[PDB]
Amino acid sequence: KVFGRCELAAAMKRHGLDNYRGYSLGNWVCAAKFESNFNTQATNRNTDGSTDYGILQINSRWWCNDGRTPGSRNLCNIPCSALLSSDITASVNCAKKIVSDGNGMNAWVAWRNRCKGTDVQAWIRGCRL
Ligand SMILES: CC(=O)N[C@@H]1[C@@H](O)[C@H](O[C@@H]2O[C@H](CO)[C@@H](O[C@@H]3O[C@H](CO)[C@@H](O)[C@H](O)[C@H]3NC(C)=O)[C@H](O)[C@H]2NC(C)=O)[C@@H](CO)O[C@H]1O
Ligand SMILES: [Cl-]
Ligand SMILES: [Cl-]
Ligand code: NA
């Protein structure tokens, strides 16, 4: 599924991401825009052999099992394919674990480089929330 901006904002709000660990909703919508262009099916392979999955591009070396990232952990206890679903529940639940892990949203390179320190509330302007 390719979400609309406000559609995704509303879905993320319902799943408790607004102000989760202090990150306003706009941060999460911004991170999803630049990680995946709002496409739940996005995948990208990294040089270390791990793969990033889904709307928040969650990485298979630490967070999910895809059967081909040797010596990886599965800290979210889920197959990486669960993260590609049109239902964002699995991605959100896993992201909550990632963002609690100490480095905050800096775990998302696109958030660090393209969202951090910007006017992120712009990502939710015009949305009925
Ligand atoms: C969205 C996504 O999948 N992002 C990936 C990043 O998570 C990943 O960076 C490394 O991720 C983990 C968690 O953010 C870090 O491990 C933790 O680091 C803290 C701080 O040092 C430490 O206190 C924790 O105990 C430790 N926990 C565990 C379980 O390991 C790790 O430090 C991150 N970065 C580095 C440079 O090590 C990167 C790199 O694989 O990929 C993203 O896609
Ligand atoms: Cl907000
Ligand atoms: Cl933080
Ligand atoms: Na993993």
Side-chain angles (χ1 to χ4, degrees):
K1 178 176 181 182
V2 179
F3 273 81
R5 179 177 58 89
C6 295
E7 186 189 15
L8 176 62
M12 280 172 163
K13 193 191 182 94
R14 178 168 76 90
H15 279 104
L17 279 184
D18 190 18
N19 292 314
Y20 190 86
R21 284 286 178 145
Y23 290 93
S24 66
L25 194 59
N27 284 282
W28 297 101
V29 178
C30 188
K33 169 71 185 183
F34 294 124
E35 288 290 349
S36 71
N37 206 26
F38 297 147
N39 181 2
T40 65
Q41 295 196 74
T43 57
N44 286 283
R45 193 88 191 257
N46 309 114
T47 48
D48 63 0
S50 64
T51 300
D52 302 328
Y53 291 86
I55 198 146
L56 289 174
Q57 287 291 272
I58 290 165
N59 184 262
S60 66
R61 196 149 110 200
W62 308 94
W63 302 110
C64 62
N65 174 60
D66 67 359
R68 64 164 200 201
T69 310
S72 74
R73 313 173 69 43
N74 180 9
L75 286 177
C76 289
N77 194 227
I78 50 168
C80 298
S81 64
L83 301 177
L84 305 179
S85 172
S86 59
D87 185 323
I88 68 176
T89 301
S91 279
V92 169
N93 289 350
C94 188
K96 287 176 171 169
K97 203 167 285 211
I98 300 173
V99 75
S100 303
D101 198 70
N103 296 104
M105 281 197 77
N106 297 294
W108 285 277
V109 179
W111 178 85
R112 193 154 59 66
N113 287 333
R114 309 179 69 176
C115 298
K116 186 173 190 177
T118 76
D119 178 19
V120 292
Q121 321 86 72
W123 288 101
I124 55 169
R125 95 269 169 193
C127 308
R128 192 157 29 217
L129 300 157

